[PDB]
């Protein structure tokens, strides 16, 4: 009885995978640079709190 819902889930999974594949490289480059600035912030946690 839940087979149309299975079809909907499969189609949505395919579409979401395609969208995530399209958007992934930008996200991962941003994550690399965000790790850079996050290490920057972590090295000066005390300075940020004082600020």
């Amino acid at each position: 009885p839940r087979m149309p819902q299975i079809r909907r889930d499969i189609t949505g999974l395919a579409n979401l995978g395609e969208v995530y594949a399209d958007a992934s490289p930008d996200l991962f480059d941003g994550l690399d640079n965000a790790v850079t600035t996050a290490r920057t912030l972590n090295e000066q946690r005390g300075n940020l709190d004082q600020a």
Binding site: M3, I6, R7, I10, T11, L13, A14, N15, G17, E18, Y20, A21, S24, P25, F28, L31, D32, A34, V35, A38, R39, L41, N42, R45, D49
Partner: protein, 98 residues
């Protein structure tokens, strides 16, 4: 009988299953080739998020205090832009002659 119905329903979605497999393959390939970025994220972001959660109240207080200052500053500098400009423009000559 139920297996017949279930197998018919699954076979009717073979193209969608293949497309989902291909899409998941592409996404997982991109993520696997950025696994280094994933490791670098998971090594250094959780401490930052934890410390931010530790000092959320202080950050909110700082933002609110700066906003309290900036609202009054904005009202003062918007209610006294043109008037100050005109007063300076008019007072230039008395200043020079003095």
């Amino acid at each position: 009988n139920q297996l017949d119905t279930f197998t018919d329903e699954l076979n009717q979605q073979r193209e969608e299953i293949t497309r989902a497999i291909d899409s998941t393959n592409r996404l997982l390939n991109i993520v696997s080739q950025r696994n280094d970025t994933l490791d670098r994220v998971l090594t250094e972001f959780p401490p930052l998020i934890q410390h931010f959660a530790e000092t959320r109240d202080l950050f909110a207080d700082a933002v609110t205090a700066l906003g309290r200052l900036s609202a009054a500053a904005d009202e003062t500098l918007s209610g006294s832009n043109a008037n100050l400009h005109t007063n300076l423009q008019n007072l230039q000559r008395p200043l020079k002659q003095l």
